[PDB]
Amino acid sequence: ELKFLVVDDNSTMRRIVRNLLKELGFNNVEEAEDGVDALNKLQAGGYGFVISDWNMPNMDGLELLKTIRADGAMSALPVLMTTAEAKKENIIAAAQAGASGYVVKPFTAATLEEKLNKIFEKLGM
Template sequence: MALDLAMPILVVDDYQTMVRIIRNLLKQLGFEDIDDASDGTTALQKLKQKSYGLVISDWNMEPMTGYELLRHVRADDSLRTTPFIMVTAESKTENVIAAKKAGVNNYIVKPFNAQTLKSKIEAVCGA
């Protein structure tokens, strides 16, 4: 199964430069429908308004972290199955384990390139 380049993707990061970088990488890969949110609270509101094929979220954000966002998504029956990739600058084993336990589909450590992002999306969304 090929990647669905038309699927809507939500990029969640409080650092606008990172949002731009991820958005540009996604566009390089051929994705067009890309929304963004600057924190978990805003992301949760957007997730309730629109059906996303994938969430790519930073871990470290205020007031709601990517980890808390992930827990909210997995606890919500209508959002539970949404593929979720966590992005972080830290590769702490306990964070990876916590995210896995909370139901993250995949994990990317910054910095990363388009190829890394593509392989993670393929692993999550089935290519």
């Protein structure tokens, strides 16, 4: 029942991640095309977890996270960052920006499941 918000400007990837969540049980998934479109929905309330790509137009992954964290209403949302390669500086920036975790594409449902569990475990959910 967790309402997930999947943010990626690549329609296919949003489809991949959605099927992976569904494969793990989560079907209350929503999709956004970029940080801005995500903020428009997140502000509508209802979401309990965010998964975002690092590179998107209008508002990228790192700015969307700073924006989310900076907003009191959206301060507690777990944010999982998806990336390619995952170079140190990025992990460090995502880390200091307050990311809940990051995963490198292409990941599998098994890999996604592990990440979701480390997050939930810390959060107790």
